[PDB]
């Protein structure tokens, strides 16, 4: 454990992870707009930014009219956040505070919490439990969470990139004159027989059926933290668009910002159908391709769990049934 | 190496694989009717090229479980009479005879990181007939001072945030510079010709036929260099790359030649150093086994930029 905590401290004390997040234009613009559109809720109010990093979101809250923002950041990057806030002339309004949000002392309960807390597959090494701790300890009753909720989606996939990698061996002879098609079964076992979650970018063309929402996390609910331990998940059914080898499933998330249209709020999506983000998607490969047809029914249950060795390490239990075949299960973990 | 991904990367490196193919096939005269040992044959592809070049026999020695797939590949291609996959380390496999030629793809990042060179040298001692053919036969090491456009972009990102999002983050630049260059790691990254700040300098050569080479690697291989800069730019450090030469044809990982999966090994100074046209840079580069692990590459860099005093930086992979 203390080895892991040291690793995360070093990672977020370093520039590259913050450069990745801020260069994620879809992510950073979504937060900027979700915050600024909530000026009515934030004007003259106080904000707690959980895991403020470089402090950019806290400054977005100040530009939306917040009177006080507490930017709490555990890693050594809090010192760069202090400099950034000072450079923008905002240190009277935005107060960068080092250390974990779980032991920070604030002058006051706050009107709003903002946080970019999401990990790969939503819950791998995420900040969610810190956000929920902060909501319990520091958010006023009736206060605002930005974003307010997260939604999880699944879809069966035919991964064009995996198809290529699997067909690679049969294509050697055409380029180099050596028949290597006998490597195909071997490559399939290596590339699909493992039980690791694969974080890879997909395109809409890989999606084999209508994507299905299978879970929703309402961050304001008390006891959501207890559900995380038992597992975040749900059941799904869909019907395939057409003929293709089924390779498994893609899991992705979106988060929703309150305010604006109460039936059309602002959404930051990591769907393969939407512009790419640094989160990509979480791929769950079957042990081998399964041939499927138009209107082939696929159903099952997907549960996101902590790993036994490490509560921060995402585990996914997949139970699934492809049309006629018998129900199968596969148990995945993030590497 | 029991897994497909490294072998797929290897064969999908088109510059590498076509250069090996041609290095072998263009040596048809020297290989016709001769015997070959393929050291670490992997999937067996190079062994089959040797058969197309007219070798009368190829022993394909492979220590990892992938030898079972190479046996299948050989059989599938109709060459089981002529290409014999032998499992296990080349140090202890027993060949029926000494061979006329050795083929091997042994090179690592920075040439010698986690490479197969030691096993090629062992096989040469034990099984190559006198003056036998080595494919490739030699490796050449090159260094060039660099101004890394990607690093510049990464360092300049923070000053661009005020435009992208209305928040000034220019103060992050010194921090990013320290993070991205203050470390002592070798960085494997592909550069382009635009990054090269002076004429590349060959600083060492390795002759694979030589009996003393294995003990020489332990002491380090390298040597001095001198160059003068093309123009004004911030010097970020040096790039180290290699080529291998087949007896007559060169497989190059230069940033000035088509990209390969080896990319180049980048050696960043602690911070950028301004340089101008004809600024003189001299120094020495040594490739060494690291103390904790002889397979891990260490590079000791000594360097003098124009008037500045001579400095040292000690990198590891
Ligand atoms: C006295 O002991 C405790 O009570 C205690 C002590 C601890 O060390 C605790 C460590 C926790 N977790 C963690 O270390 N996670 C690391 C990976 C973050 C996930 C990726 N999300 C993400 N994009 N991060 C954005 C920024 O959030 C920053 N950050 C991350 N977590 C926090 C946090 N709790 N408060 C403030 N800042 C935080 C990061 O540095 C990063 O810059 C949890 C609870 C903890 C409780
Ligand atoms: C008395 O025992 C020893 O002293 C000894 C010495 C060794 O180096 C041993 C190495 C082993 N395996 C491995 O993975 N080592 C990782 C480093 C290779 C990085 C670069 N290699 C590369 N470009 N790939 C070509 C192919 O060469 C294959 N290979 C690699 N080395 C050999 C070898 N000695 N004979 C035959 N085949 C070999 C690989 O499997 C790969 O498929 C196992 C056992 C070994 C035992």
Author numbering:
A (entry chain A): 43 to 377
B (entry chain B): 54 to 301, 308 to 376
Study text:
Protein arginine methyltransferases (PRMTs) are important therapeutic targets, playing a crucial role in the regulation of many cellular processes and being linked to many diseases. Then, another series of compounds (12a–12h) were designed and synthesized, introducing also an adenosine moiety and exploring the distance between the three groups. We also report crystal structures with various PRMTs supporting the observed specificity and selectivity. On the contrary, we were able to cocrystallize the compounds in the complex with both PRMT4 and PRMT6.
Structure determinations and refinements revealed that only compounds 12a, 12c, and 12f are visible in the active site of each monomer of the PRMT6 dimer. In all the structures of the complexes with PRMT6, the electron density for the compound is always better in one monomer. Compound 12a is the only one for which a complete electron density is visible in one monomer of the PRMT6 structure, whereas for 12c and 12f the electron density becomes fragmented after the guanidine group and the density for the methyl-4-hydroxy-2-naphthoate moiety is weak. The crystal structure revealed an unusual distorted U-shaped conformation adopted by compound 12a (and probably also 12c and 12f) in the binding to PRMT6, with a folding at the level of the guanidine group. Whereas the adenosine moiety lies into its canonic binding pocket, the guanidine group of the compounds is unable to reach the PRMT6 double-E loop clamp because the linker with the sugar is too short, even for the longer compound 12f. Instead of binding in the arginine substrate pocket as observed with PRMT4, the methyl-4 hydroxy-2-naphthoate moiety is sandwiched between the adenosine and the side chains of Y50 and Y51 residues of the α helix motif I. Hence, the binding of compounds 12a, 12c, and 12f affects the proper folding of the PRMT6 alpha-X helix containing the motif I (Y50-Y51-X-X-Y54).
